[PDB]
Each structure stands twice: as C-alpha cells, then as structure tokens.
A = this chain, B = another copy of it.
Amino acid sequence: AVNQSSSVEVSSESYETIFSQRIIRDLQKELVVGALFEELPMSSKILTML
C-alpha cells in the first residue's frame, strides 16, 4: 500500500509525504441582501416621526 516495496529495499509506512500550509475554499453564493439597502443612523433605542 503506502508500504511498498517489501522484497527487499528499505521502505516505510505513512508520514513520509510533504504537507501544505495553504487553505482552499469552494465558490460560495454571492452576497446581495446584506449589502443593498440604505442605512439610517440612530442614537437612542426607538425613532419616531410624523
């Protein structure tokens, strides 16, 4: 398997292989409802108007 040959030369089991420090990610769904509508600033708790 990983442990190949076995007649006759020196070969190991696992943890021989090089590892990588980069991270990959799939193509996530686009962001649109969270970044479309206008902000209204407030400064209390409730806002009232007529």
How often does this chain occur in the complex, in copies? 4
Minimum CB–CB distance for A19 against chain B, Å: 6
Tell me the nearest residue of chain B to A21, going by C-beta: B16
How many residues on chain A are close to B (CB under 8 Å)? Answer: 4
Chain B nearest Cβ from A17, distance in angstroms: 9
Scan A23-46; emit 1 where CB is below 8 A from any B CB, else 0. Answer: 000000000000000000000000
User: Chain B residues with Cβ under 8 A from A14's Cβ?
Assistant: 19
* Chain B nearest CB, measured from A4 CB (Å): 14
On chain B, the residues within 8 Å of A15 by CB distance are: 19
Could you show 3 A-B contacts with beta carbons less than 8 Å apart?
A: A14-B19, A15-B19, A16-B19
